[PDB]
Amino acid sequence: PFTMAAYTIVKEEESPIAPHRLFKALVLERHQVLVKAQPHVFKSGEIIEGDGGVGTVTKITFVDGHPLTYMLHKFDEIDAANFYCKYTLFEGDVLRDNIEKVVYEVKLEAVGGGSKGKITVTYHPKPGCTVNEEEVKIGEKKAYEFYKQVEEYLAANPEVFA
Amino acid sequence: FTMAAYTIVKEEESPIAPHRLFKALVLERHQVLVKAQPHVFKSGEIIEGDGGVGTVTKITFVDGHPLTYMLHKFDEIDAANFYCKYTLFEGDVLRDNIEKVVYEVKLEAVGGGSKGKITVTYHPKPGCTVNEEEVKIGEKKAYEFYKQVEEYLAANPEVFA
Amino acid sequence: MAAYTIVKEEESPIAPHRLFKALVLERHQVLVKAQPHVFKSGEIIEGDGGVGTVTKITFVDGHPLTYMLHKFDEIDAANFYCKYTLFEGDVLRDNIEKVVYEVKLEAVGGGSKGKITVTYHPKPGCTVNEEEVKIGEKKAYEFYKQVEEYLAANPEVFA
Amino acid sequence: MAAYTIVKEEESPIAPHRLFKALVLERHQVLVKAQPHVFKSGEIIEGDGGVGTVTKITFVDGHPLTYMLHKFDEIDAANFYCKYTLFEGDVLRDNIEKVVYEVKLEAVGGGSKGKITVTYHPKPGCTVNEEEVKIGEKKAYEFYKQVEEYLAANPEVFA
Amino acid sequence: PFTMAAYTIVKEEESPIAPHRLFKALVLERHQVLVKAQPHVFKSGEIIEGDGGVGTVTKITFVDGHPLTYMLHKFDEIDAANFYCKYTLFEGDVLRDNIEKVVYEVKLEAVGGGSKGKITVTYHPKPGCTVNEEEVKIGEKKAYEFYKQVEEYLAANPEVFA
Amino acid sequence: TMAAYTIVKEEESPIAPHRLFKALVLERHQVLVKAQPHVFKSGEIIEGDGGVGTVTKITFVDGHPLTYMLHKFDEIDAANFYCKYTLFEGDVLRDNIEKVVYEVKLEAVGGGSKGKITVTYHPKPGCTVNEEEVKIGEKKAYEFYKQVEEYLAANPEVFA
Amino acid sequence: MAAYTIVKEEESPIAPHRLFKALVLERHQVLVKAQPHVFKSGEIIEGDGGVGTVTKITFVDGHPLTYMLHKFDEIDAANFYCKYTLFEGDVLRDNIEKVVYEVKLEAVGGGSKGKITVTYHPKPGCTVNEEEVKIGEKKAYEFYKQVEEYLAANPEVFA
Ligand SMILES: O=S(=O)(O)c1cccc2cccc(Nc3ccccc3)c12
Ligand SMILES: O=S(=O)(O)c1cccc2cccc(Nc3ccccc3)c12
Ligand SMILES: O=S(=O)(O)c1cccc2cccc(Nc3ccccc3)c12
Ligand SMILES: O=S(=O)(O)c1cccc2cccc(Nc3ccccc3)c12
Ligand SMILES: O=S(=O)(O)c1cccc2cccc(Nc3ccccc3)c12
Ligand SMILES: O=S(=O)(O)c1cccc2cccc(Nc3ccccc3)c12
Ligand SMILES: O=S(=O)(O)c1cccc2cccc(Nc3ccccc3)c12
Ligand SMILES: O=S(=O)(O)c1cccc2cccc(Nc3ccccc3)c12
Ligand SMILES: O=S(=O)(O)c1cccc2cccc(Nc3ccccc3)c12
Ligand SMILES: O=S(=O)(O)c1cccc2cccc(Nc3ccccc3)c12
Ligand SMILES: O=S(=O)(O)c1cccc2cccc(Nc3ccccc3)c12
Ligand SMILES: O=S(=O)(O)c1cccc2cccc(Nc3ccccc3)c12
Ligand SMILES: O=S(=O)(O)c1cccc2cccc(Nc3ccccc3)c12
Ligand SMILES: O=S(=O)(O)c1cccc2cccc(Nc3ccccc3)c12
Ligand SMILES: O=S(=O)(O)c1cccc2cccc(Nc3ccccc3)c12
Ligand SMILES: O=S(=O)(O)c1cccc2cccc(Nc3ccccc3)c12
Ligand SMILES: O=S(=O)(O)c1cccc2cccc(Nc3ccccc3)c12
Ligand SMILES: O=S(=O)(O)c1cccc2cccc(Nc3ccccc3)c12
Ligand SMILES: O=S(=O)(O)c1cccc2cccc(Nc3ccccc3)c12
Ligand SMILES: O=S(=O)(O)c1cccc2cccc(Nc3ccccc3)c12
Ligand SMILES: O=S(=O)(O)c1cccc2cccc(Nc3ccccc3)c12
Ligand SMILES: O=S(=O)(O)c1cccc2cccc(Nc3ccccc3)c12
Ligand SMILES: O=S(=O)(O)c1cccc2cccc(Nc3ccccc3)c12
Ligand SMILES: O=S(=O)(O)c1cccc2cccc(Nc3ccccc3)c12
Ligand SMILES: O=S(=O)(O)c1cccc2cccc(Nc3ccccc3)c12
Ligand SMILES: O=S(=O)(O)c1cccc2cccc(Nc3ccccc3)c12
Ligand SMILES: O=S(=O)(O)c1cccc2cccc(Nc3ccccc3)c12
Ligand SMILES: O=S(=O)(O)c1cccc2cccc(Nc3ccccc3)c12
Ligand SMILES: O=S(=O)(O)c1cccc2cccc(Nc3ccccc3)c12
Ligand SMILES: O=S(=O)(O)c1cccc2cccc(Nc3ccccc3)c12
């Protein structure tokens, strides 16, 4: 068949945060950060397999009250210096029933005393599924509010990764 | 036909990030030179421009110091992309044989750090020759001062952030 | 807003400079050699094969379709990398504002592999079909097939 | 290391796209059009005609010089911007490694103004014959005035 | 009882010739092309163990009168998809008494109509020997000459190994 | 035409790779001090989290002839127990040495390991490489490895 | 979590070299020779002829099936060992993910022995059929005997 039936989103945003600051906080140490940022949803942040760099995979344990339980992510392609990333989740009740995997691709660029981000995120539908075209704002929505939050903390304390 | 200038093209790496060097070693290079070297630098201030392109700073040296002051104007500033074109265009730092020294700076973010490429051009007055030293001693200073700035910034992460 | 994208993972015996030239750099003039039964003419309207160059491709008189202009956004031929815009043209229906292709081939032994990221965009306050998307793919996929056959049997072409 | 640089401002009655096309884009070719007693051929050997493009300029057999090579670093035929480099040939000799040219034109009336920057890059621990400078400046300024005269007199060319 | 110091040469080069033809010419089907380009020099060249792939042992014949006689090359590693090879010259009179082995690590890239390349050549001495920088420059010039002949021949005939 | 000198070595050990690869690659900068607190004062990563591009700095003891040396992980593949790290800065190079490249490939063998290691000596343009440097360097690196081996054999929890 | 394995010990008076060259290496070419009224062609599309090679098998004008896709996984002609996958064709009949034939011949006297282990894999949600696999062994076994006797007749065949 015309086998190409997948769902991807790409946005760009502007923040007064040196890239290195958002990369560390939203990619390199996201597992650690989501917890400190939304302590009420995340109980633990840790690496299961890896010593940093590519090939390292994350475990994100929710508080024992949250509908969800954990996220599995792994480090695919990392180009440190330019702030480029490809990672994805490959197991955890967070799937919500409409994906085989979720590949997150991000690349940032220094922009004044802040940054520019190009985010490629692909929600992979599965056989006999019609990936929720209404479930789009939501998956995104968790990451944005968490972005807006990491920001403020990062804006408030510049020495944290600068 | 046209008089040749002596050009300095420099490639530099730092652990310090781009908005911070560019802050220190360009716009507030005159102000930071005082904070940076109070045994040589009496005062740094802007005498033309509110801080925008075509701005003219004025740098004066402690009295007993041979040199008196320096004037640089900002040809153009792409602050967004950390580019500046600036020229040293007055003072006895120039002696007689130099008409103007042009500085061209552009940085790039590289991880936690920064890469910086910088040109400097020495325009010799009509007929006179290029004071090779002028450049060497000009190079030594602008840098030695950078190196001082880097240890200070590394040591102080809340400055220019 | 809407973001319904395709993701190709094609691979063929043709060397990548041969396809990068045949399907990216010189597509417009190649579309007429291959399907002289659909296309009358393919040429740049301004530009230097760099970025900001614009091609126009005219369909035969009889054809319901009239024309399309392509504008290169960014290139890097030595790497067989291109992102190109289909902004104006008859074929461009109401629901669609543009379609965007992103090319990056690589060498594989005496041939190549390539991942494509076509991106059919809608016009303010209008929705994107599957049919529409499904046809673009068939057109382009069929074009290459017809071309692969040709670069295969005439190896000097763009070699 | 010590580089010798010539920056200057020039002014022409000739339209800024014609002058650029003639003295940047098609230079390798127009060099041969305006001085057939010096150059026998002018061509591209690497690229389409965009950044990274490499030209070969060959002198007539009887000329002492043999050929020279140039590469484009950046073009932006949109805003008349180019940076190219002379990185091979006997005009370079042993002292000089390469010569980099930055041109930036713009329209003033039916004509133009420009800023050219030539910088002769001497090999490690070598000197640049301040003369090598004065010779380049000359050869080019002459060429530019020849062409300007043809173009003034032949208004349809590159128009 | 320290190891024998082996002499390593690292070269980077370029050809407008495409890398599949150049790998074929200068790696895969070398033993035969040596014979096409310099017949005044080489009599024959063959496969006498292996299927082209890894483990292959090639034997190349000098002309009768040539002061050199024979050489066996063994293919240590072959990844023909990525233009990457590693093979060994171990058997032959070209090997001065003072030389145990010459190992070649080749890796080409694609650049437009042609290629970019990195070649590693290490000459391994025999027990308690001084590699004569003589022989080093010797083969090295030989094989670059060869590089230049072939390149010129290919640029001439675009189908060969196309 | 300007050469470099390379020592190619194949090794065996009763320690398992993953353990060896952590002792003698990643945390080599640290352990060196553990192993030889009389030669080294510290071992630290200036730049990186541990990945391609990561650089480390190792400091010698006050009395020792040397001062420092930093290494660059040009390539890593902890999954395959392969690495490529270069010594590019330090007194240890004299004036003669441009850089030293370390290429390691370890391989599980029963409860043990076999390691394939190359060490390439690249000289400063125009300068030579004197075996003196490369006999003294192989030996140092290897003595260290035998100390480590002992310790980890007698300490099964360490880098388990 | 299912798969139909089948281990058969066989013995023959043909030396293991020829047997390896006739029911493994050149089979596909040999099937048309012995059973021509059943076959058209055996060839390669993307294979060296050694480890990692592929083959394809075409019957005659009407035969139900069309062609068989056999890869090569692990070869060692020296020790007359071979694995060859069968993942495409229409003999898979919607049940067969693949069929993995695994051979290993050894010289005995002037003849040979053989441990043959065919295999039939199931695509998730497919029935691991009973008598179908029974035709597998039948086809092959029967050929072997035709071949076996042929190599007796013409002994110089395949040295
Ligand atoms: O710690 S917290 O103040 O809770 C914290 C709270 C909220 C947002 C944060 C964002 C980035 C880094 C933090 N700290 C951090 C701490 C340890 C390692 C890395 C980052 C943030
Ligand atoms: O987006 S994340 O930034 O990882 C994220 C950030 C912050 C809180 C989150 C809570 C639940 C699920 C996530 N992921 C998720 C993913 C897809 C759909 C719905 C939720 C959360
Ligand atoms: O917020 S989102 O784009 O949704 C976002 C979504 C998912 C992953 C992200 C990773 C880094 C930065 C983001 N945002 C960002 C925003 C402004 C400036 C810089 C980075 C990410
Ligand atoms: O960013 S937040 O408001 O935090 C936010 C939190 C949670 C879900 C969101 C979904 C869409 C847009 C948001 N931002 C937004 C901001 C301003 C106006 C409209 C939407 C969402
Ligand atoms: O202006 S800077 O290089 O910033 C500079 C920075 C710091 C200290 C300096 C001392 C003397 C002269 C300078 N300039 C100079 C310029 C041209 C010729 C000779 C000296 C110094
Ligand atoms: O475009 S092709 O599909 O190969 C093609 C298809 C059909 C007919 C063609 C006739 C001539 C040249 C072609 N190609 C060609 C391409 C580039 C340069 C010169 C000729 C033809
Ligand atoms: O428009 S063209 O007809 O080619 C053209 C014609 C004549 C002179 C030109 C000079 C500069 C750029 C052009 N074009 C261009 C177009 C698009 C992008 C960049 C440059 C010129
Ligand atoms: O393939 S499509 O055009 O999508 C197509 C879609 C639906 C029905 C079609 C019927 C005939 C020919 C087609 N193609 C065609 C294309 C170009 C010229 C002439 C006919 C049809
Ligand atoms: O530009 S291509 O798709 O490559 C293309 C290639 C070959 C033939 C085509 C014929 C008609 C329309 C196209 N574009 C088109 C685009 C979107 C939807 C439907 C048709 C054709
Ligand atoms: O046209 S159809 O067969 O309707 C078609 C149907 C379904 C999927 C297709 C995918 C690609 C190309 C098509 N056409 C095609 C035509 C000729 C050669 C190669 C592909 C597809
Ligand atoms: O795949 S196609 O469907 O023809 C295709 C469809 C749409 C756009 C394409 C652009 C470039 C190359 C293609 N093909 C390609 C084929 C083989 C290798 C590399 C690229 C494109
Ligand atoms: O005169 S040239 O200035 O070289 C010249 C300059 C610029 C553009 C030209 C275009 C056509 C012919 C020329 N010359 C020419 C010369 C001899 C015979 C025919 C044409 C052009
Ligand atoms: O070089 S050429 O010989 O035109 C060439 C010929 C044929 C196919 C090519 C494909 C890509 C790039 C080229 N050149 C190129 C050169 C420099 C920069 C970018 C592309 C190709
Ligand atoms: O090679 S020439 O074409 O003359 C030449 C061409 C252009 C620039 C030159 C600059 C210096 C010396 C040359 N030659 C030279 C020749 C003899 C004696 C001294 C200098 C130059
Ligand atoms: O450039 S030179 O002749 O070498 C030169 C050298 C010294 C002084 C000159 C004064 C005017 C014109 C020149 N040249 C000139 C050359 C060609 C045409 C017209 C004038 C002068
Ligand atoms: O390419 S041009 O300068 O414009 C050039 C233009 C016209 C005629 C020239 C004759 C000789 C050398 C050139 N180049 C040259 C370059 C460097 C030094 C000396 C001469 C000539
Ligand atoms: O002739 S020169 O300036 O020497 C010259 C030297 C080298 C490259 C040039 C390219 C374009 C125009 C020139 N002249 C020019 C003159 C007037 C207006 C704009 C450009 C060039
Ligand atoms: O003993 S030796 O006789 O020199 C000797 C003789 C022959 C082979 C040897 C190999 C390794 C180490 C030795 N000696 C050694 C001595 C002291 C400490 C460490 C190693 C060897
Ligand atoms: O043509 S030859 O004259 O033997 C020849 C001459 C010189 C260099 C050659 C290099 C590679 C292949 C050849 N021949 C070749 C011929 C047919 C197919 C493949 C390679 C070369
Ligand atoms: O290098 S080869 O490419 O095989 C080679 C290629 C072409 C001609 C050769 C002639 C003599 C010796 C070789 N090899 C050789 C090797 C090592 C040391 C000395 C000579 C020749
Ligand atoms: O000529 S050499 O570099 O010596 C060379 C020496 C020995 C083996 C070689 C194998 C392939 C290509 C070469 N050269 C090459 C040159 C430029 C680009 C790609 C490959 C080989
Ligand atoms: O090898 S040759 O075969 O004479 C040769 C042939 C063809 C082109 C050459 C270009 C540059 C240098 C050569 N020789 C060369 C010789 C020694 C050192 C560096 C280059 C070239
Ligand atoms: O530091 S440990 O982590 O145990 C350690 C880890 C790995 C290897 C070690 C080798 C020698 C000594 C250690 N410790 C040691 C401690 C005190 C005095 C002397 C040696 C080693
Ligand atoms: O400390 S050592 O380990 O020997 C040492 C090892 C490796 C490299 C050295 C370089 C310079 C001096 C050292 N010390 C030195 C001591 C005496 C004579 C010569 C050099 C070096
Ligand atoms: O760095 S290591 O080999 O790990 C090393 C480990 C342990 C002790 C060392 C003492 C001196 C020099 C080293 N390096 C060295 C490097 C090159 C030449 C000579 C000595 C030492
Ligand atoms: O020759 S034939 O008589 O066609 C022949 C006919 C019928 C069955 C055969 C079976 C195996 C080999 C043959 N011959 C063969 C000949 C040469 C090479 C390989 C196989 C068979
Ligand atoms: O069998 S024979 O026919 O004599 C025979 C035929 C062909 C080749 C033979 C090779 C070795 C031994 C035989 N004798 C032998 C004896 C007992 C068992 C197996 C082989 C050979
Ligand atoms: O077994 S094969 O050796 O390929 C085979 C060998 C000889 C003749 C065959 C005829 C038909 C089908 C086959 N394969 C087949 C396989 C499984 C089930 C049914 C038929 C034949
Ligand atoms: O068992 S058969 O059914 O012919 C058979 C069926 C399918 C594949 C076979 C592959 C090799 C050898 C066979 N037979 C064989 C027979 C005697 C000795 C050695 C091998 C194969
Ligand atoms: O296909 S059968 O119809 O069964 C068959 C029936 C009668 C005679 C046969 C002779 C050889 C092979 C067969 N194949 C074969 C395969 C396995 C076991 C027994 C025979 C023969």
Numbering used by the authors:
A (entry chain A), E (entry chain h): -2 to 159
B (entry chain i): -1 to 159
C (entry chain B), D (entry chain j), G (entry chain D): 1 to 159
F (entry chain g): 0 to 159
Question: What does the primary publication say about this deposited structure?
Answer:
PR-10 refers to a multi-gene family of plant-specific pathogenesis-related proteins of class 10 that are differentially expressed by plants under stressful conditions such as drought, salinity or pathogen invasion. After much debate in the literature about the biological function of these abundant proteins, a consensus seems to be converging on their role in the binding and transport of metabolic mediators such as phytohormones, lipids or flavonoids. Such a ‘molecular container’ view is consistent with the canonical PR-10 fold, which is built around an internal void (cavity) formed by a seven-stranded antiparallel β-sheet curved in a gripping shape around a long C-terminal helix α3. The Hyp-1 protein is important in this context because it has a unique set of three ligand-binding sites consisting of two internal but separated chambers (sites 1 and 2) and a pocket formed by a deep surface invagination (site 3).
When crystallized in the additional presence of melatonin, the Hyp-1–ANS complex formed crystals with a different pattern of structure modulation, in which the supercell shows a ninefold expansion of c, manifested in the diffraction pattern by a wave of reflection-intensity modulation with crests at l = 9n and l = 9n ± 4. Despite complicated tetartohedral twinning, the structure has been successfully determined and refined to 2.3 Å resolution using a description in a ninefold-expanded supercell, with 36 independent Hyp-1 chains and 156 ANS ligands populating the three internal (95 ligands) and five interstitial (61 ligands) binding sites. A similar association is observed in the present structure, where dimers are created by antiparallel association of the β1 strands of adjacent protein molecules. The characteristic zigzag pattern of the two columns in the unit cell is the result of the noncrystallographic 21/9 screw-axis operation, which combines an ∼180° rotation with an ∼1/18 translation along the screw axis in the direction. In Hyp-1 this internal cavity is divided into two distinct chambers, 1 and 2, with a separating partition (Arg27) and separate entrances, E1 and E2, respectively. Stabilization of ligand molecules in chamber 1 occurs mainly through hydrogen-bond formation between Arg27 and the sulfonate group of ANS. Site 3 is created by stacking interactions, with the ligand molecule held in place between the jaws (Tyr150 from helix α3 and Lys33 from helix α2) of a molecular vise. The ANS ligands in the superficial sites 4, 5 and 6 concatenate adjacent protein chains into a unique helical pattern. Furthermore, other buffer-solution molecules (sulfate, HEPES, citrate and dimethyl sulfoxide) were found in the structure at selected ligand-binding sites that are typically reserved for ANS.
